[PDB]
Paper text:
The plant protease inhibitor [name] from Enterobobium contortisiliquum is a classical [name] belonging to the Kunitz family. A Kunitz-type inhibitor that was first isolated from [name] was named [name]. It was shown that [name] inhibits trypsin, chymotrypsin, plasma kallikrein, plasmin, human neutrophil elastase, and Factor XIIa in the stoichiometric ratio 1∶1, but not thrombin, bovine pancreatic elastase, or Factor Xa. The fold of [name] is a β-trefoil, typical for the STI-related family of Kunitz inhibitors. As found in most known Kunitz-type inhibitors, [name] has a single reactive site located on loop L5, between β-strands 4 and 5.
In this work, we investigated the structural basis of the activity of [name] by determining its crystal structure in the unbound and trypsin-bound form. The structure of free [name] was refined to a higher resolution of 1.75 Å. The final model contains two inhibitor molecules, two imidazole molecules, two glycerol molecules, and 244 water molecules. Molecule A consists of residues 1–134 and 141–174, whereas molecule B contains residues 1–134 and 141–173. A loop region containing residues 23–26 of monomer B is in weak electron density, but is still included in the final model, whereas the density for the loop containing residues 111–113, not traced in the complex, is very clear. A molecule of [name] contains two disulfide bonds, one intra-chain and one connecting two chains. However, since the crystal structures of [name] were obtained under mildly reducing buffer conditions, the disulfide bond Cys40-Cys86 was broken in molecule A of the free [name], as well as in the inhibitor molecule in the [name]-trypsin complex. This observation indicates that the disulfide bond Cys133-Cys142 plays a more important role in stabilizing the β-trefoil fold, whereas the disulfide bond Cys40-Cys86 may not be as necessary for its stability. The equivalent residue in [name] is also Asn13, which similarly forms a network consisting of several hydrogen bonds. Taking monomer B of free [name] as a reference, only the Cα atoms of the P1, P2, and P1′ residues exhibit minor shifts, whereas the remaining residues of the reactive loop are in almost exactly the same conformation.
Author numbering: 1 to 134, 141 to 174
The structure:
Amino acid sequence: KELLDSDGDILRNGGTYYILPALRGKGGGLELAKTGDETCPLNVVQARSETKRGRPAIIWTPPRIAILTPAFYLNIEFQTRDLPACLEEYSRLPWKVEGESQEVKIAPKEEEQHLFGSFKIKPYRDDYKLVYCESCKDLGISIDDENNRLLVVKDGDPLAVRFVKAHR
């Protein structure tokens, strides 16, 4: 039980991966979406189409070690290629759970001293789940009024995922 990407390679500290659903039929990989009223796509969501792999995420922990295990506290951030205009000015797109709403959002304006990695990746059935440590709670999907598949803290109904190397 190492954390493995879909090829069977151990997840690398600082490696870049698509986060894809382990199960079929409910949507595709994780990406960004504009939700509610915001003019900028700040919510982490699951793509509605099964065909979409979404946006690669860089996953890393401050310890300067080569690989990741379920014991490490992770920063997760979206890779920044091909961004909409309102995000182009940022070089980093860190995931951060919004207290009260429990939505996973990116926080590109937050100052670095206020950003830390609170996620873990855990084995889940035959693949993986993401958890957020506030003890740890599963990340899952909550559907909003416009049918966006929001990634949110949802203890006990995790989104099953696997990690695919993002080549480029």
